[PDB]
Design a protein around this ligand. Sequence first.
Ligand SMILES: [Ca+2]
Ligand SMILES: [Ca+2]
Ligand SMILES: [Cl-]
Ligand SMILES: [Mg+2]
Length: 208
Amino acid sequence: YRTRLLHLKGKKHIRVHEVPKTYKSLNSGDVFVLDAGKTVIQWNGAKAGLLEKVKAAELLQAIEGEREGIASGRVVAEADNDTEFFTLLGDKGPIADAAAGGSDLEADKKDQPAVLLRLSDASGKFEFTEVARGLKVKRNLLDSNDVFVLYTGAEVFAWVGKHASVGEKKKALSFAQEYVQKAGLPIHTPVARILEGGENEVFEDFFD
Ligand SMILES: [Ca+2]
Ligand SMILES: [Ca+2]
Ligand SMILES: [Cl-]
Ligand SMILES: [Mg+2]
């Protein structure tokens, strides 16, 4: 499994980004999730906000539920200097202060990375079209008749509507994988094909 470091940040709402796997990506003002597959660790900065911890905790719960006992979750404080955390991280050093991580209020306004796209072949050919971005990505936009691709800021999901066509169901994953390429995202960005009706905890977690 490829260990990923996720960075959660915000005041009125929370956005997540994947950041380089190193202590230098951390800052005491925010909350981070180190996803090492079967071990997932939430790291709370000393000055982390309540909402950042809450949504990081929701992410851990969703990952644990989707991985069905294979993955265990644990939360550590920055002051704990958790040795397993820094071992899975790969290095250790001085943690940048909250000021160096930037303003949460600025992040709310300037950093909304979510993107929702639709894949439909109702016209006789595949059309892959952006539907919404940022906070305007709402669950009500999903349509059982088509396939939808959601970028959360950390992961890409290919959501397959129950009434999607044969071509849409077959090509859903390839369009989601190709989105990572065209959008210039990290090559190892996780892409997952999911079905309407599934529990899909991490996907559903994005919307609440
Ligand atoms: Ca913060
Ligand atoms: Ca369709
Ligand atoms: Cl602030
Ligand atoms: Mg949530």
